[PDB]
Amino acid sequence: VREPGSQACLAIDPLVGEEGGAAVAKLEPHLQPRGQPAPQPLHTLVLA
Amino acid sequence: GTLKTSNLPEELRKVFITYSMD
């Protein structure tokens, strides 16, 4: 008989870098609000 | 959050709109 002492099997486990991983970022455009005095289209009429 | 600005050249700012009366 032989003993597995020296030849024992190996388990594996990755060295995950999640602890130092950057996050996913969401973008939102800062709308030029119409609540603030934004301009409007100058629909014109004629006084005949 | 943090602010970002687009380098969009004026040439790429042109838009055309097609629609119907309703």
Q: Are B4 and A25 in contact (CB under 8 A)?
A: no
CA A17/CA A14 separation, integer angstroms: 9
At B11, is the secondary structure helix, strand, or coil?
helix
User: Helix/strand/coil (H, E, C) string of chain A?
Assistant: CCCCCCCCCCCCCCCCCHHHCCCCCCCCCCCCCCCCCCCCCCCCCCCC
Tell me the CA distances in angstroms from A44 to A38, A40, A48, one per residue in order: 18, 12, 13
Residue A4, min C-alpha distance to chain B (Å): 57
Resolution (A): 3.0
For A16, list phi and psi in degrees, rounded to 5. -65, 135
The number of C-beta contacts closer than 8 angstroms across A and B is 3
Residue A47, min C-alpha distance to chain B (Å): 26
What kind of experiment solved this structure? cryo-EM
Q: Are A38 and A32 in contact (CB under 8 A)?
A: yes
